[model samples]
Target: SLSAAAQACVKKMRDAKVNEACIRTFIAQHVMVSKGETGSIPDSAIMPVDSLDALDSLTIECDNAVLQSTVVLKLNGGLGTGMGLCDAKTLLEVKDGKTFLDFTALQVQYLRQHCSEHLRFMLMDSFNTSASTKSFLKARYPWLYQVFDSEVELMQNQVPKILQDTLEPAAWAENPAYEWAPPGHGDIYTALYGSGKLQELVEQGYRYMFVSNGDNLGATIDKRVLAYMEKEKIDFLMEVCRRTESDKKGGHLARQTVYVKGKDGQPDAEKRVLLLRESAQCPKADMESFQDINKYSFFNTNNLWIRLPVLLETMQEHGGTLPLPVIRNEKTVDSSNSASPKVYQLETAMGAAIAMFESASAIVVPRSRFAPVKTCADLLALRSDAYVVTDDFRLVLDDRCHGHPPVVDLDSAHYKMMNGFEKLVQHGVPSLVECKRVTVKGLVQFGAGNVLTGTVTIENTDSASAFVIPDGAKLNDTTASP
Candidate 1:
């Protein structure tokens, strides 16, 4: 009976003119899951990257050859829906009232000018955002527009949503837009090829690509990392950092052992495969093992460096696919409405490709290189004084402050959306540079030029209403629990 639903999914995909290859891939993943393949990688199989000194010991010149042959590829397919925004997330302002797109363009512009090099940067946009992103760039940064002849546009692939109840194409007449989602960043490879951008890069003399998220301002190109890739002749390199409680749920890299028949037909000894496993890949009973942070301490920043030639060769070998691990994301047709039809969004993570490359490498990077604004909480931190923008638009913590970055807890009920957050901090966000931690419990407003120093906690105890910080008030090593 269940196989009937699964067959319906395959037929629907075939009828929609989806590539037979992609459909087969989907069927393979479904079978893998049905056979209890949670893709839960055990800790014993993975070897820990114990030190950052490897990069310190190795060096390569960031010469003209390296600079001329590299392109900055940004994943720009996000909508600011989480922050109650309807347009491209790149348009949302970060710090000092500049949009993420503003900073990205400025950063790339700086690199090209100051370094006096021919460089290229472009967005991997989706069906929903490519037009808007292009319009915004051409209108404002026309100069950055001319840098790339045609790398400005590349699109990610979309996969059909599957109804959990019937395993067929999701039927949501209320909003057909809800019937599909981007197949994760892994589609970047296919999109590049299908769009002919891969051949364009190779023919234009570009040999390397640095890929990162459009909203991750911290993921600016690093000369050292690029140099390492060039010197070591690495086909694929991933930047990772030690994981803490905050990012424990992010995908972790591990080695998986598999055995196959040798040329003589006898089974060969089990060989290890390095994989990036997300939380959804974990088996229900493996949650405790998955959460053991010390065992798997590093999390990918999604900042990848790859030699263009290797990228093309790998895709060619896989019959136009990268053999990226599949991720089955279950959600209601309308994410906000539980009553909506249940559906599965089949996706893939780009970093999961690390397992496929033979000469892949991982290098530890500074925490400053991986800051991402995925929620309103991150937006608050970015807007505050805790983070400062550099000449190149790189967001880094103010060096003068000591101890850890401030821990902010704003009442989600009052400050979840960007609009609501703006209303609460109408006057200003309290100075966050010197503060060690801030825990705000109630609906509170602040006046202009006020500062909260040291470890400060503001709470509105009264259930009836909100509170306000008077103009020019300053708190030093104090707690206002009222």
Candidate 2:
């Protein structure tokens, strides 16, 4: 799949340890807790990826044999459409080595050149993954690796135009809803068949496909996980991790008995992915009060592995497609009755959760392995932060032989006041929480609703309010950034 130029760059990444297994668990923990809210991997236990003994310290049984086979990596490259932003998010780089395009190419090249298996490499692009995008990056960085051929490496998915009234795939360009919705990534399975990529997979003599979104490098190349899928005898595997303190806002990895019209079928009243967040898996006392599996432990990284025959047959047998959940602005809809600024409350009305669902025959990974980077800032964090949760097999998947230092200061601040604040209150018993709530009859330089916290943050979504907290500074944050 790699062009001659790409193959050359890959030689530099040769000694790159695929982590065997020990190194992988370290990165997994980092991914689980590095997000503002990556959901499946709670941003509660962010750590560096290269730390191996860090993993052995978990003192828990880490069955390395679980990962015994090899899998072809299907890197999904169809991104770029967001807030008028016009390039694949994967290509955006805050890192030094290369843009996401270069990063992926390097992965493909590494497997092709070094690994034992003729490692199947797939670069899943879309219509939007324009040739110009490639040209632009190739021109800018030639040494990294500028290359590829359509047949062996490049594969694209279908871009469906969904109908508004029926909420089905329609080609109408004028529908306002079309502006926000692009064909879902779920289309990859179909695209493989339609775009001839699936045939290519067969032609290449590959069996299992370890498919994942390409935006984040944490999911770069997980060898152990691919092997684990086969060892588990799982037809389809959905990676899941234990939810941690910060995952309250993301979808929980869960299981349910939804009678789908058939497997991989559409979600009607009869089919849906239910969160164990409900009383069944969780206690009525809720996450903070009592026993609740939902408590920061029930997260889904969504890095999936499917037997080629199984996934192919599921689509063939059902002849159906899965619709991705569309999130909208709820408060904006409510305020339309009058006049007000749009409050960004996401509305996922098109459908509910994708079956992070299990078939009683699937496998779940520890939370450490499931890390997904969607935001520009997360990409920034990923630059130095070696790895993120690359898979979701969490639930006592003790990433570390020792416990991640309990966020005891979960509420208790280690510092009573930062240096700048110490200057402001001088001798007064310093507390930013209380100081912000002071009677502002003085400090005329500041206005009525202004209480300075030395940091300024802005958020339009209720899920991410700004607060003066450092990275990995766990516990809930709802205050304004400044």
Candidate 3:
């Protein structure tokens, strides 16, 4: 149904000051080049075409722009116990010089510069995370606020953990506060809604919002994707890339159907994603018997988009759940403790109905843009690819890059060491410190930025000695301080 304010009117994502005319230009350019379809634009238009393969290159650039619109929102909720850190995973540098917060800021800066939309950057903070991340953002990008009233925003997500007796959200860890936790990444929807950021983007004339996690900086802002959102008029847009043999650990794409109990004591909640129940597994069993699920092998990259209007209504009006198929896996929750409690680990799903039940969609996109930061090893993978193309993350960073950044042989020893890279040295390549387990108390917090690279070397001591950047290697030429 059209929104009440939009009865028969094109109520643009609650009023986007969008240059719809420009967006159409971008789409037309995409169609012409991509489909080899015939189309023309005035010389006065933003001449998007390049040479022969150059025309193809335009599509890549545009695709990059379109996909980037979805900002990566991190669920930095895990507690880092091995190396021992507190809340605020964003502050810790997996490498040595830069923290996860550093990587996030760099992403925001680059995306804002590349994409047409002034899509904002923000986060969902926990008890300790809230203050630390806020301070970090202020210190890192002081100029962002100076330019755009408030470029970074933060909000809290409900920590409804599972309860045993009533199978409900209890207040203790054993009965844990947010124990059942909607699901791995399910905390996002309500987190954004309660933040006032959703309405803020809408009020500021932005329409679609792409949400991912902070650790994975792969997601960016794109106008064409937003136009696609407008065209479909769908409530939400999920970016799913085809699953590959190499990515067997990834989440799968699913939609909501009738509501169910999900894995734990998520209790009687609406919009429950039903992460891993018999329904999802039954299909898996049947498919394995016949190799059928392989034909439709798509997985969740944790990249999703929500139409501002649709998202608002779901949170404020509709039952906060979706009718969708939930993706899950058969796994060993704890090899050490058989009674420790684990489920068919559904990476995401619980509470999907919050927005999906009202309006939703799943979009399959190219796999090229979906590289994720799953471990320190994966960061080295991203660097290798990015460097392979441009030598550095930015082509304009230097002439030594020739036309791009330096190249690397990922098959080399360096790649293997990425996963084990510790704080002893800091070689400046992107790195991620991940901690899977955590303290589920009201003040739950996990931090792991100390395990990304091979070792730690202080390129700069003003900052913490967290990254092990290679001798001449620097994140960007601009960060190479004397």
Candidate 4:
């Protein structure tokens, strides 16, 4: 039934010289999903992660020499269009006039200076972000390239978007580029293998890989976690944290009963595998169950540790595809225009591969390890005193707040875009170390040296002029200015 679509996609992939195995796997999943497959992980198959390794229980006794065999990989594929920015998301200034890439580079430098100098760093950039990211690095962190010893960036693969109605390749003459989209972070495996970097790293003696999103400044290399994984001989280790009401929409870790083929004529035996269920993969009937925090309990931090040898062996065994479940996303081809033709973007998440290895496991880490800036509210909290850069260059919450980051909600109309948000806070971001929650409605601007503490809400009733909080004012409760 998907022959026409398959042929069209294969020809496009072949023309682009994508990896053969990736093409095959993409087409296979496309066909299966088009035939009315939801790829849902039912609530019955999920078990609460009550007992597992905890970060507090792990010891950081591993030799500094272990850093010699480890590599740090960052998924830097997003364009941050959600924040009304056209450039690479990591290039946005986060703290002290430094971009996310700057902090990442500094983290690596600090680790190398203190630990073994043989450590390596790499980025997986998609087609939309590769050029800008590379140019930014070359201009700013030129010395950082020495750490990689080879290519510092791995290109993520792009696949054709299929038209929802006809199951044909999407065509946008206005912008042919929009016809293609990156195949999610799950493309990391195939991209690494197809680019020959995985094999190169393995041959060069790199044994472990620490992977996280480029925007997550808190996801640094933890010595205890690394040591635990190496000592326990775990093939794949996913960092997870307890799910809260705010994190209900994110993916969570669960266990699934799978049957592995037996050797020769023996019957297949049942086994439990750790699986990740993303919100996009959940069916409408199971959306409530999927978002039930008490049921799943633990959500993925997207901070993962992988043994290089095992990753290589698994990919090779599976012919370059990691057996990750398909995640189908439906959206208009032109994201800015809702009336544009609808299309389906087939995708997968890297963490979903936890089910592929029998030795896969997960650990419950504290919330500090999962700080990602996805929206303007998160960015404001991060830029304020609510978070602090430690001596070792890690971005962490200030102890005064007692590990609770202030809840910040800015009027989306005025704060959603970078330009508008920056113009409003041009004087400076408010001090939020002691702040509990801050909400701004209408066009409210902050003057220099303003301190917001303990549930502050500012509203502007006068539309003729933008209301400015007086300089050096300490705001505690609601303030409405006419």
The worst-scoring run of ten residues by lDDT in candidate 2 lies at 405-414
Measured with C-alpha atoms, the lDDT of residue 30 in candidate 3 is 27
Query: Which ranking of candidates, highest TM-score first?
Result: 4, 1, 3, 2
lDDT of 3 by residue, 228-284 (tens): 655656566666666566544443443333445656645654552212122234334
- Give the clashing pairs for model 4: none
RMSD of candidates 1 onward, in order: 3.5, 16.4, 17.1, 2.3
lDDT tens digits, residue span 27-80, model 4: 877887778778766677677666788997887766888888989999898988
Question: What is the lDDT for 190 in model 4?
Answer: 80
Clash number for candidate 3 = 68
**Local error of candidate 4 at residue 201 (angstroms):** 0.5
Which tens-of-lDDT digit does each residue in 314-424 have in candidate 2?
544434332223232223212233333233221221112234334312234544455455432233223322222222211111233232211111111211222222222
> In angstroms, how far off is 423's CA in candidate 4?
1.8
Between prediction 3 and prediction 4, which has the larger lDDT?
A: 4
Tens-place lDDT per residue, model 1, 382-424, is 7888888887777778875652567677778777778778887
